[PDB]
Amino acid sequence: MNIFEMLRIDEGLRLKIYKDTEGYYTIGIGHLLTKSPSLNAAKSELDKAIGRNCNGVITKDEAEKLFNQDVDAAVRGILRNAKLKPVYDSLDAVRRCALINMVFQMGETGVAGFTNSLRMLQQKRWDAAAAALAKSRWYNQTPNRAKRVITTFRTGTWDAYK
Ligand SMILES: [Cl-]
Ligand SMILES: [Cl-]
Ligand SMILES: [Cl-]
């Protein structure tokens, strides 16, 4: 199991613009297009991102390319962020994927707001970290995915995904 397979399980793959759980226009493997209500705005963003007139539809390859970009961008933002970097450095490999999962989903700023959870993980207090992470809108809105990520942090294994 690797980060790409983990996220493909959590986000799915769709080749036509769809609305995410929050109602925003997305495509491929959890690639957010725009927060805007406009489908046209979405289509414009999409074309800008692919480099061609897509008319709301992309290929598998195109979807994987966006995914390669987003995962890379998530990892590099972690490494650049003063709050995230030290947590990431302190973690084992599996747990590292779990942080990358959160960042891909909610962005760097979002994850960086989880002050106490961050501290608990840096301290390797797994159980405490799992409990704090659960007290969030994130957990309440997408409980199945959140539980899977939380279990990855708690155990340090890929059990939740197997
Ligand atoms: Cl927290
Ligand atoms: Cl709550
Ligand atoms: Cl969910």
From Swiss-Prot:
The UniProt record lists the keyword RNA-binding: no
Result of changing E11N: Loss of 84% of enzymatic activity
One Gene Ontology term, aspect cellular component: host cell cytoplasm
Binding positions (substrate): L32, F104, S117, A132
Pfam families tied to this protein: Phage_lysozyme
Induction description: Expressed late in the viral replication.
This protein's UniProt keywords: Antimicrobial, Bacteriolytic enzyme, Cytolysis, Glycosidase, Host cell lysis by virus, Host cytoplasm, Hydrolase, Viral release from host cell
Active-site residues, record numbering mapped to chain: E11, D20
Effect of E11Q: Complete loss of activity
Recorded consequence of changing G30F: Almost complete loss of enzymatic activity. The enzyme is destabilized by 1.5 kcal/mol
Gene Ontology molecular function: any one: lysozyme activity
GO terms for biological process, alphabetical: cell wall macromolecule catabolic process; defense response to bacterium; peptidoglycan catabolic process; viral release from host cell by cytolysis
EC numbers for this chain: 3.2.1.17
Signal peptide bounds: none
Main subcellular location of this protein, as a coarse class: host cell
Intracellular or extracellular location(s): Host cytoplasm
Record field: catalytic activity: Hydrolysis of (1->4)-beta-linkages between N-acetylmuramic acid and N-acetyl-D-glucosamine residues in a peptidoglycan and between N-acetyl-D-glucosamine residues in chitodextrins
Reported pH dependence: Optimum pH is 7.3.
Annotated family: Belongs to the glycosyl hydrolase 24 family.
Record function comment: Endolysin with lysozyme activity that degrades host peptidoglycans and participates with the holin and spanin proteins in the sequential events which lead to the programmed host cell lysis releasing the mature viral particles. Once the holin has permeabilized the host cell membrane, the endolysin can reach the periplasm and break down the peptidoglycan layer.
Full protein name: Endolysin
Biological source species: Enterobacteria phage T4 (Bacteriophage T4)
